[PDB]
Every structure is written in structure tokens, then in C-alpha cells.
């Protein structure tokens, strides 16, 4: 069994190497099967607050709401990593149909975009600082990895198949 | 679909 930080460096480097790479549960397992608390396993993504500050209704509902947001946030990350970045990548509008209906439905969703590099705030959206030519590839890959990892954990929790199901359910309010 | 521009700016196109 690979060490936590060993597997983490490996996965993050692979995602940076190939932006469209799919990760299996077998690869991700050392990251989510760890006995470490949720707040300790995530070093960039604020997974703890995401789970806690969006506990509205039953877990069957809000975990799916969170999963939907995480699915889109992952796409935002992979876009920044792609060899050909999509047009208009330097900014995300709050009134964007995709963002508004998926990411902005969760508290902390905008903070994830800030982690990607969208740190400058205007009343109409977030964007990269003027003068910053390229995204921080190492940072984006790390955040993207943690986003897809968290979505994976929520999927397992919903399927009642998470290796640390019993412990993680205590985080569900 | 577009994930960056505002809904109205996308509606202009
Ligand atoms: Cl994946």
C-alpha cells in the first residue's frame, strides 16, 4: 500500500502531465482510505467547509448538490491545464448559466475558483490578475486532483461503499 | 457550452 504523500505526488504529477487523464478508484484509494481526518487529507481544497457549510436537507440531496458543483469545478481545472485552453478562460462571470446553476449553488464554490487563480473580484465575476500570463500549473493540478477526489468520496458515501464510511458519516449534518 | 461568459453575452451570439 502506497503512502499517502507518495500516491498524492504521483497522481498530481500525472494530471499535470495529461490534463484529460482519468483516475481509477485503485489509484485514488490511498488518498481516501487514509485514517487521517478530512481536514488533514486536503491541503488546498477546503473540503471540510464544503461538506459542513452546505448541509441543507438530507445527505441524499446536498451531497448530490455538492457533487454537481465538484463535477463542474473539475472541468474548470482541466481547462486551465489543457494544451489548448478554451476561449475566455481568464475570467468567470457569476451570471454564466453553467456556473450559476451548478457551482454557485454551493457555499465555498467561488473559493475553489480563487484557488485556481481567479483571485480578482468584480461585482460581475472573478478573473485572473492583469499581468499574470499563465495559470499556476502545479497549483491547478493539485486543486483539480483534490476536487475530483472529493467528488469520488461523495460518490462512495452515497453508495455506502466508502472504506471510511462509518467515520465520514459523522461529518454529515 | 460556454462556462466563462455571462448569459447575456452568450445570448448576443
Ligand atoms: Cl477522473
Numbering used by the authors:
A (entry chain A): 7 to 179
B (entry chain C): 53 to 65
Which sentences from the paper describe this structure?
The linear ubiquitin (Ub) chain assembly complex (LUBAC) generates Met1-linked “linear” Ub chains that regulate the activation of the nuclear factor κB (NFκB) transcription factor and other processes. (2006) identified the linear Ub chain assembly complex (LUBAC), which consists of the chain-assembling E3 ligase HOIP as well as HOIL-1 and SHARPIN (Walczak et al., 2012). HOIP also comprises several NPL4 zinc finger (NZF) Ub binding domains (UBDs) that target it to ubiquitinated proteins (Haas et al., 2009), a Ub-associated (UBA) domain that mediates interactions with HOIL-1 (Yagi et al., 2012), and N-terminal PUB (peptide:N-glycanase/UBA- or UBX-containing proteins) and B box domains of unknown functions. Here, we show that OTULIN interacts directly with the N-terminal PUB domain of HOIP via a conserved PUB-interacting motif (PIM) in OTULIN.
We determined the structure of a slightly truncated HOIP PUB domain construct (aa 5–180) bound to the OTULIN PIM peptide (aa 49–67) to 2.0 Å resolution. The two molecules in the asymmetric unit were highly similar to the apo structures (rmsd ∼1.5 Å), which was consistent with NMR analysis. Both HOIP molecules showed similarly well-defined electron density for residues 53–65 of the PIM peptide. In analogy to the p97-PNGase interaction, only PIM residues 54–58 interact with HOIP. The PIM peptide forms a 90° kink, in which Met55 and Tyr56 form a bulge and mediate key hydrophobic interactions. As expected, the OTULIN PIM peptide binds to the conserved PIM pocket in the HOIP PUB domain. The key PIM residue Tyr56 is buried in a pocket formed by Tyr82 (αA), Tyr124, and Pro92 and formed a hydrogen bond with Asn85 from HOIP. The second hydrophobic PIM residue, Met55, is bound in a shallower groove between HOIP PUB domain residues Tyr82, Ile78 (αA), and Val104 (αB). More importantly, Asn102 in the PUB domain acts as the cornerstone around which the peptide is wrapped and interacts with the very same backbone of Asp54, Tyr56, and Arg57. Arg57 of the PIM peptide participates in a π-π stacking network with HOIP Tyr94, which is the only residue that undergoes a significant conformational change within the PIM pocket.
